């Protein structure tokens, strides 16, 4: 519940190592004495595992992740491990997988169980008539929303006193593959050599529950007993491991069990064992895989003339809605970051643009219908809004794409004399056309009077004037309205608008002038004409380049030098090896320079011997006298 542990102390994270553990049966398949390999989420050899234990003032309970899949050791003596809380986010809003056994039943409930602030199991009253009674059945608060309650057959809950050795060595492998919360276990009673768990172990499946949920966390229901405020915790430890996608080489016996299990990436000798499908390697040099120089990073060069954005947007001579000055925008740097920092706007409405890729994606033909109107008439210029503007003189179509940008200039365009020169339309004769300037300057005849210029009797003059007083309200302010229309995907893009540094002599992954290339970037010496950009080789590939931002001649040398060569003697002779990389320069990392490549882990000799293990270029290898692997030029014969 909430009673805190008196024996809780922050013990340091002792990083022990899973030596030979982590080998399980993959499925129900039998073979007879083959060397079968596979690759799956495994506990790797000689990898860190966090040492956990209990003592009379150190007793903890870590929230541990269950992301990939976990390994679990347990060196009990008197059942210090009791149960498991396999909760995803340790919440009762979702269902937490509870596993518990009080030496009666392995009770599995896929239910919503609330994690208490300090749940604890344990035993007490072990002086007279003990019978292994339990401390507190208060490891939860809520109990609801059960999909599948389950009781398996109870395992060997060791009520028998087996003290001393770690014979209660419980190996638990837990993972999920497609809703299968599988238990891969095998209780292996140890044989005492010197006090420690190490040896060749094999594990098997026990039960599966096809549930279909995820779990990302776990704790473990511990026990308390004294050889925990009133009944302390004894001396019993365990390890905690994970699962990583290693590649094993399993050897089977005659009658079922695994005999040898060899992980690949532990040393390249084991990699050679993986490749050759043999646990015993004969005498000779071999070849495991390839070598790949890693690309370090990338170099991207953005393009840098400018569109009239300090000119049209900062103009003085303006237009009207009755006749708008259609700006011609074609093949200019569409600087939309200087459109972005302008916080002086009033109404900025971008309908069908790519507003994240303003500078990235660029457009075919941009038409800026910029015209200054009265303040209230901004809400009508929209696909979906009509009225005094949209159906009278200036129609955006229903296939409109572009922005509508407005900002006020009440300090300059307002006047006591008033900006009555910019005239606007009030009535409507014909159905309004999209993107067509209606400049019909004829009297709006609404009757049987042929006006033809005169006003008065049935002669309506809708060509009215802006009253831009210096004390205008919010509806009469002169807004510098720009409806930035454009044309999308009907031409190759003309109106088109943060580069990186230059890194030479390193294996990077550049992106110069559309192509994303990879190689060590040096500087060439050729004669590039200023239009000539791409050097081609005899193999018709990219050889020598130039930055489109800064004029400079470059040279490219590709990465991924050669492959992996493995030098070994006979396995019955020795198990020390030597590493050779195929025709590389000594860069990666004893270290020798040969014509065959950079040699690793050998001794050079000022003599010459008869060739046993050849390498190349008249250089052979041998295991002579401490005995090690020496590198030497081959003896050509007896100088008789």
């Amino acid at each position, epitope marked *: 519940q909430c009673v805190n542990l008196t024996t809780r102390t922050q013990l340091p994270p002792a990083y022990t190592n899973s030596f030979t553990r982590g080998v399980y049966y993959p499925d129900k398949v039998f073979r007879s004495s083959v060397l079968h390999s596979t690759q799956d989420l495994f506990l790797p050899f000689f990898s860190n595992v966090t040492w956990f234990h209990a003592i009379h003032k150190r007793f903890d309970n870590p929230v541990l992740p269950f992301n990939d899949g976990v390994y679990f050791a347990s060196t009990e003596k008197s059942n210090i491990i009791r149960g498991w809380i396999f909760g995803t986010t340790l919440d009762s809003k979702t269902q937490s997988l509870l596993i518990v056994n009080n030496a009666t039943n392995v009770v599995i409930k896929v239910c919503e169980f609330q994690f208490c602030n300090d749940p604890f199991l344990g035993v007490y009253y072990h002086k007279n008539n003990k019978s292994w009674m339990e401390s507190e059945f208060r490891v939860y608060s809520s109990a609801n929303n059960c999909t599948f309650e389950y009781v398996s057959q109870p395992f060997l809950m060791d009520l028998e006193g087996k003290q001393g050795n770690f014979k209660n060595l419980r190996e638990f492998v837990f993972k999920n593959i497609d809703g299968y919360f599988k238990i891969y276990s095998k209780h292996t009673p140890i044989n005492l050599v010197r006090d420690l768990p190490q040896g060749f172990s094999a594990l098997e499946p026990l039960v599966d529950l096809p549930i279909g949920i995820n779990i990302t966390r776990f704790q473990t229901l511990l026990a308390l007993h004294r050889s925990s405020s009133g009944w302390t915790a004894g001396a019993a430890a365990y390890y905690v491991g994970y699962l990583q996608p290693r590649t094993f080489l399993l050897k089977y016996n005659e009658n079922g069990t695994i005999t040898d299990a060899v992980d690949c990436a532990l040393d390249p000798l084991s990699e050679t064992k993986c490749t050759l499908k043999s646990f015993t390697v004969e005498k000779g040099i071999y070849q495991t895989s390839n070598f790949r120089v890693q690309p370090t990073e990338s170099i991207v060069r953005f393009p840098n003339n400018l569109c009239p954005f300090g000119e049209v947007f900062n103009a003085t001579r303006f237009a009207s809605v009755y006749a708008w000055n259609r700006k011609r925008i074609s093949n200019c740097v569409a600087d939309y970051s200087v459109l972005y920092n302008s916080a002086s706007f009033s109404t900025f*409405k971008c309908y069908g643009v790519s*507003p994240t890729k303003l500078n990235d994606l660029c457009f075919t033909n941009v038409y800026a219908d910029s015209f200054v109107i009265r303040g209230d008439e901004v809400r009508q210029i929209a696909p*979906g809004q009509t009225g005094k503007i949209a159906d009278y003189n200036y129609k955006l179509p229903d296939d409109f794409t572009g922005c509508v940008i407005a900002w006020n200039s009440n300090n300059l365009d307002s006047k006591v004399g008033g900006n009555y020169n910019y005239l606007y339309r009030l009535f409507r004769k014909s159905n309004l056309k999209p993107f067509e300037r209606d400049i019909s300057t004829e009297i709006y005849q609404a009757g049987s009077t042929p006006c033809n210029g005169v006003e008065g009797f049935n002669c309506y003059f809708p060509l009215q004037s802006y009253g831009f007083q210096p004390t205008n309200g919010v509806g009469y302010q002169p807004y510098r309205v720009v409806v930035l229309s454009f044309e999308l995907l009907h031409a190759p893009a003309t109106v088109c608008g943060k580069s990186t540094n230059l890194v030479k002599n390193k294996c990077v992954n550049f992106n110069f002038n559309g192509l994303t290339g990879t190689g060590v970037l040096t500087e060439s010496n050729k004669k590039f004409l200023p239009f000539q950009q791409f050097g081609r080789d005899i193999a018709d590939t990219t050889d020598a380049v130039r930055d489109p931002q800064t004029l400079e001649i470059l040279d490219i040398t590709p990465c991924s030098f050669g492959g992996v060569s493995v030098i070994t003697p006979g396995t019955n002779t020795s198990n020390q090896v030597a590493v050779l990389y195929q025709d590389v320069n000594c860069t990666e990392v004893n270290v020798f320079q040969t014509r065959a490549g950079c040699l690793i882990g050998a001794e050079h000799v000022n003599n010459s011997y008869e060739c046993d293990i050849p390498i190349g270029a008249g250089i052979c290898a041998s295991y002579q006298t401490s005995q090690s692997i020496i590198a030497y030029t081959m003896s050509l014969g007896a100088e008789n």
Partner: nanobody
Framework: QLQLVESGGGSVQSGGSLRLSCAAS????????????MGWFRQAPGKEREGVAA???????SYADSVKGRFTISQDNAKKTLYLQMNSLKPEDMGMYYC????????????????????WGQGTQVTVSS
């Protein structure tokens, strides 16, 4: 005509943790996109309709600094449903919440101004007792 359905109200105390939700209705989605400029325009008893939590089509959230640090507006574009996790309601959070609509893209300094919203929802009410 583009319409919206406010919901998510609830009469709580001073410091309530609720969530708003704006169900998308209407007939016009006048854009080639499904991402829009929206915002929960609260109109308090005794104050005007004000931009409290607003977000545009790119995700630039617009907040007021008196209510900043508690609320969480999340425009779920896969269902066109605007949300506002009303966390720890101060006593000025009472009011009729209006999610407004726009088929366009507004910046961070114009999402709070309700002058450019020609499509308005119904409205939801939250009673924040002090």
């Amino acid at each position: 005509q583009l319409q919206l359905v406010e919901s998510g109200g609830g009469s709580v105390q001073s410091g309530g943790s609720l969530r708003l939700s704006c169900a998308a209705s209407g007939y016009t989605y006048k854009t080639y996109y499904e991402t829009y400029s929206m915002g929960w325009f609260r109109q308090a008893p005794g104050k005007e309709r004000e931009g409290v939590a607003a977000i545009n089509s790119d995700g630039e959230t617009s907040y007021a600094d008196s209510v900043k640090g508690r609320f969480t507006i999340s425009q779920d574009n896969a269902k066109k449903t605007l949300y506002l996790q009303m966390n720890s309601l101060k006593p000025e959070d009472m009011g009729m919440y209006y999610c407004a609509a726009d088929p366009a893209w507004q910046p961070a300094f114009l999402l709070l101004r309700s002058s450019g919203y020609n499509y308005w929802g119904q409205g939801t009410q939250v009673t924040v007792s002090s």
